[PDB]
Amino acid sequence: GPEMVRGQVFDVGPRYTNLSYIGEGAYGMVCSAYDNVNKVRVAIKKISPFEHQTYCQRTLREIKILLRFRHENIIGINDIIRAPTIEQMKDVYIVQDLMETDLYKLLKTQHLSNDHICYFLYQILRGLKYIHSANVLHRDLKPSNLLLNTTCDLKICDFGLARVADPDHDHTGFLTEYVATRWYRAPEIMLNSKGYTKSIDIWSVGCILAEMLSNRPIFPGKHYLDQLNHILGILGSPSQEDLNCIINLKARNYLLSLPHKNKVPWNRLFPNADSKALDLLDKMLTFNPHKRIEVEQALAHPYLEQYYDPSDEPIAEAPFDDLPKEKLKELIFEETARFQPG
Numbered sequence: 001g002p003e004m005v006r007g008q009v010f011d012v013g014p015r016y017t018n019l020s021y022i023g024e025g026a027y028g029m030v031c032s033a034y035d036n037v038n039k040v041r042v043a044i045k046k047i048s049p050f051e052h053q054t055y056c057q058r059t060l061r062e063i064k065i066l067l068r069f070r071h072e073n074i075i076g077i078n079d080i081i082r083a084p085t086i087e088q089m090k091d092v093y094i095v096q097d098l099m100e101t102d103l104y105k106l107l108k109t110q111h112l113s114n115d116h117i118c119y120f121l122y123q124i125l126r127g128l129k130y131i132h133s134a135n136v137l138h139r140d141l142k143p144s145n146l147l148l149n150t151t152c153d154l155k156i157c158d159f160g161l162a163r164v165a166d167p168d169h170d171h172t173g174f175l176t177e178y179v180a181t182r183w184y185r186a187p188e189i190m191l192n193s194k195g196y197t198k199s200i201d202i203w204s205v206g207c208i209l210a211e212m213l214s215n216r217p218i219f220p221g222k223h224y225l226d227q228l229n230h231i232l233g234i235l236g237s238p239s240q241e242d243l244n245c246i247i248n249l250k251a252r253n254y255l256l257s258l259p260h261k262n263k264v265p266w267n268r269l270f271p272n273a274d275s276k277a278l279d280l281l282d283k284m285l286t287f288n289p290h291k292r293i294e295v296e297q298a299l300a301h302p303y304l305e306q307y308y309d310p311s312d313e314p315i316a317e318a319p320f321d322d323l324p325k326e327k328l329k330e331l332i333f334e335e336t337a338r339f340q341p342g
């Protein structure tokens with residue numbers, strides 16, 4: 001008699017019991033459950049990826065990366081449940097620390113004080129410093145991928161779209177298709193970037209900081225090129241120098257074809273914000289990715305002075321594919337073996 005939540009079997013017993021629905025997404029479904037061994041409630045997510053290569057790849061990145069990383073501001077993996085044989089394995093359950101909420105839900109429902117914004121932003125950047133120090137790009141930072149406990153400790157989650165950084169192969173054509181979440185996409189993704197540089201993640205953090213200031217997404221576009229309408233609408237027209245960095249003619253001529261747009265001042269958009277927060281926001285939401293602040297610079301910014309402590313902002317002990325779904329199943333099976341009876 002396995003437990004079932006909302007019409008999905010949760011085959012996680014007997015260790016994990018008294019399940020309750022939390023939510024769902026394309027990845028599968030997440031529940032809370034009581035862990036009878038450690039005597040605490042946990043989060044458990046049911047993933048069913050084995051029919052498609054893309055879902056296999058995302059599952060393997062998530063598992064491999066999160067098992068390698070160990071950081072206070074990054075969700076870990078505590079346990080993985082799956083069948084004892086590849087043949088019988090159809091689902092993978094990933095057990096993780098239970099959190100109270102995520103920043104998406106929190107922003108829908110709660111005004112943050114400046115002290116909360118500051119502490120949240122510090123933790124996002126502290127976690128990101130470790131990620132970037134491992135030569136990894138998160139590539140989908142957004143409020144729903146930032147988890148919060150009842151004391152406002154923050155953990156980054158979802159490494160399914162992460163990649164190893166590859167700046168020498170970042171260049172591409174104009175309006176080239178992209179997977180990561182549209183409101184948090186850096187302008188260069190639409191122009192000339194594959195999102196293989198650390199600057200893509202800083203842009204996303206900037207968008208999250210703006211969202212924390214007002215409870216509303218700063219660049220709520222409707223489609224690939226509308227996203228750029230919103231960005232340019234606030235930042236204003238790019239400078240000559242910033243255009244000279246866009247060598248691709250289709251992207252450059254698109255930008256040249258637009259009427260001049262003035263910058264909207266941050267302090268007019270966010271009249272209640274701390275002026276130091278707005279100076280850091282400006283540096284994160286810099287059009288030219290080469291001029292955009294890096295994570296270690298952002299941590300050292302005056303806005304974060306109460307928390308900044310590089311000795312307590314650890315890095316990874318070392319830095320960190322077109323395989324078919326059959327071979328990816330075998331690699332997920334091997335990567336999850338440590339959690340089986342043995």
Ligand SMILES: O=C(NCCCNC(=O)c1cc(-c2n[nH]c3ccc(NC(=O)[C@@H]4CCN(CC(=O)N5CCN(c6ccc(-c7ncccn7)cc6)CC5)C4)cc23)ccn1)OC1CCCCCCC1
Nearest residue numbers: 026027041043055058059062097098099100101157158160
């Ligand atoms: O019991 C209670 N209740 C109070 C607590 C209430 N908590 C909440 O409401 C809550 C919790 C959480 C939460 N807590 N812990 C978590 C851990 C993880 C996550 N979410 C993730 O990691 C996401 C989901 C997917 N993942 C990527 C991924 O798996 N991968 C691999 C798969 N991949 C993938 C695979 C397949 C497909 C696919 N498949 C099919 C078709 C298409 N695509 C797509 C992607 C993507 C990357 C990223 C969230 C949380 C978040 C939000 N709200 O009392 C406490 C307990 C009692 C005691 C006292 C304490 C407090 C009170």
